[PDB]
Amino acid sequence: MIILGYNGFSQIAELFGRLYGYTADSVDRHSFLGHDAAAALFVDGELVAAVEEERMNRQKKTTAFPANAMRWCLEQAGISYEDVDYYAFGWNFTAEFADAAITGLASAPIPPEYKFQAIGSFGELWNGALGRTALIEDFTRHTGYALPDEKLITVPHHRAHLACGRTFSGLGDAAFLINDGQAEADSAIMGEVRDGKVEVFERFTIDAKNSLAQLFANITRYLGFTPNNDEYKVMGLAGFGKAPDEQDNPLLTKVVTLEEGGRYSLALANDPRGPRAYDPLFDELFDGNDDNRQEFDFRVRVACAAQQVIEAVTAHQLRALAEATELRDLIFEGGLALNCVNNTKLLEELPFTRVEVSFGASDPGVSIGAAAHVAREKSVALTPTESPYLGPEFGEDEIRATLEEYTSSVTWEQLPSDEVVGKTAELLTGKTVIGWFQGRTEYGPRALGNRSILANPSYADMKDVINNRVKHREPFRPFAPIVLEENAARVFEMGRKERSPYMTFVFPVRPEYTEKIAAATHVDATSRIQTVTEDSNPRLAALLREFTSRTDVPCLVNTSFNVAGEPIVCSPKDAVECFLGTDIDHLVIGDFLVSKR
Secondary structure, eight states: OEEEEEEOOTTHHHHHHHHHOOOTTSTTTTSSSSOSOEEEEEESSOEEEEEEHHHHHOOTTOOSOOHHHHHHHHHTTTOOTTTOOEEEOSOOOOHHHHHHHHHHHHTOSSOOSOHHHHHHHHHHHIIIIISHHHHHHHHHHHHSSOOOGGGEEOOOHHHHHHHHHHHHSOOSSEEEEEEOSSOSSEEEEEEEEETTEEEEEEEEEEEGGGOHHHHHHHHHHHTTSOTTTOOHHHHHHHTTSOOOOTTSOHIIIIIEEEETTTEEEETTSSOTTGGGGGHHHHHHHHTOOTTTTTSHHHHHHHHHHHHHHHHHHHHHHHHHHHTTOSOOEEEEESGGGGOHHHHHHHHHHSSOSEEEOOTTSSTHHHHHHHHHHHHHHTTOOOOOOOOOBOSOOOOHHHHHHHHHTTTTTEEOOBOOHHHHHHHHHHHTTSSOEEEEEOSSOBOSSSOOSSEEEEEOTTSTTHHHHHHHHSSOOOTTOOOOEEEEHHHHHHHBOOTTOSOOTTSOOOEEBOTTTTTTTGGGSOTTSEEOOEEEOTTTOHHHHHHHHHHHHHHOOOEEEEEESSOTTOOOOOSHHHHHHHHHTSOOSEEEETTEEEEEO
């Protein structure tokens, strides 16, 4: 009936910091699991609430116990921990897993007599992190409710990455690819969903030590970025480069071997030096010294090479899946489905007629999926849902409440909805960088027009002007446009898609609209679009239509409403504090058109 899915390990931060040197200030801060801790609630096979702890605790990609998200999810339903029939995790760390780990660490070709240091820390992880006893402890201590062992279901990560996909795909029968990084033991799985049943083809499975995702993570670090937070800069860089031939791609020759049966392996996948083992190889393959490694022309080259291996491998994978099922509807989920550029290639160059990637293709989504995996096994008939607007909402008074605490800092005017829209439109007529706070808090990495900074993409300078006022200049991060679905066909080369409401896909820009929307476009002539309707986001649809009618411009820019390193603003306070620590020209929060003094 009622199921709560969650991700989080209160101690993994300090555990990974201490045992494995992954401190909160390291470039590896985001490169241990439990990142994107969140809670999610199904009631009678309906998703009624979901928020990520990072939106609440204000710590980007948090690994914390999802205390704030759980309470909020239960309060949204006027229910309590006891009422919750079941609790789903989205990590299946079974006793049998640890053994193969303790066992495997024992068979280490590089025993330093410090296989103990290894086995010892993996035990400190197991007894305070991955263990069922450790979960029931952590839950009980943070909730106050004492998690009965009978209520806890630990769901394999991928079966949750997928269960998420399945909740949003709108599909029925379908093939699935899960390519994620951090996982239990498998890095990538494939199979199908036929007559509502999941069957995994074991023959296509890939171990955790041949992680294509990790390879991309190690490229993101090598080039001077964060390995498991900012890979978008490589995808971004890749757009300034011409892809090399797959023969001359040093990553497809010496690192990545395409084995028969849609399989693949990585060199140095057993090297004991860990993931850092590859750093020295890229140096050889790419002629890297300490001076050249973070220079643009070099980065563009590693990024180009890296971008292709993902497209090459995943293609190799799904062309095998194609010959393994007649189903031509795909579910793609896992880290690697954050590569919106590849996602559109898989759709257009491979025999699958529908590739579907959710806002929770990422890990935050295992929290939702955990619950959906449980819900289905229980004959709980799942209500189809397509909305990412799943998190906290704020009322007139709550906003007026917070806007009294900042009267010394900002003036405002509460308006009718039909005119909050109209005024913002005339502002977006000029070069305004505005903040849009509306509806419930979008789930997942990308903002979808409830916590967004809007701006007009027709101003020649606009890319620099947004970067200058939003204080978050990202040299390699392209901006993305919102467009009414009814205009997407005419504005973009949409190929085999009618709509893309989750910016999980990237489309080329028809050269009749390329000047009008150029700030929402990459050097690729590409754009990470968001299709909008009166059904998806009524107020964002109202806004778009009016701004177009005044400007004859079919798209606005939708960029995440945050400061650098900060997660997406969750609350009115969150929004106002961002507004005032930036040079955003106005905030529209609810029915208040806020101005600075």
